[PDB]
């Protein structure tokens with residue numbers, strides 16, 4: 001499951017949280033081998049007696065799932081960045097096994113885009129869409145620096161917190177976001193992540209529409225393998241579509257680097273182009 005991350009070596013142990021320090025509130029979601037709950041966590045941070053967290057309750061104990069649990073936990077404690085999901089630790093006393101994360105008040109980015117399109121309610125402006133895109137790019141720069149290949153970058157895997165802070169996570173094939181080499185040869189690299197970032201940019205600028213929405217899963221696969229490009233969204237300025245095309249070069253070595261994509265987005269976010277659809 002995490003074999004592709006073998007070159008990543010943990011410096012230290014995972015933070016352990018006492019079961020009695022976690023107080024479950026209600027389910028936030030479910031899918032990837034477990035339910036996610038909102039909860040209160042006591043004695044986690046020094047200043048606050050209690051705070052809200054998101055808790056994933058693991059469904060199994062194969063015990064290949066318990067082996068994957070420990071490795072995943074060791075990997076997540078290593079990921080520490082402003083735009084990467086914040087992992088607090090595990091609870092191993094009893095069953096089910098628990099993983100504790102930061103609670104992100106506005107939920108997933110896909111639902112956030114869909115509800116703020118066609119917190120302050122209303123449609124997100126160009127400046128706000130660029131700010132979202134720059135934050136996701138910042139997280140991807142961090143992952144590329146760690147030699148961490150995400151493999152499933154998509155807005156459904158991003159979270160929105162207080163003050164529109166965006167963080168990348170993975171809530172558990174995403175063919176529509178993949179380049180041809182990932183679909184055909186299961187080749188997942190920093191370069192296939194940059195392609196998915198380009199698709200994330202397309203999702204942002206379409207307010208969360210599914211890529212290749214006019215096509216069946218089969219038609220979408222053939223279409224990506226043949227080299228057809230996603231159309232420019234109506235809300236997308238020409239400067240931003242140039243970034244998408246850079247992420248979508250057929251040759252992985254020709255794709256723009258995430259450092260350059262992030263730098264370009266920072267420039268656009270700081271001074272948005274005067275663009276009107």
Ligand SMILES: CC(C)(CO)n1cc(C(=O)c2cncc(NC(=O)Cc3ccc(Cl)cn3)c2)c2cnc(N)nc21
Nearest residue numbers: 028029036054056085101103104107108168169170171
């Ligand atoms: C929107 C839902 C309800 C969806 O479950 N939701 C999940 C929250 C999590 O924090 C979360 C839940 N389960 C698993 C993880 N694991 C990682 O993200 C692993 C990882 C991989 C790669 C990288 Cl680069 C970083 N991290 C995270 C969360 C938090 N708040 C809210 N409101 N909803 C959440």
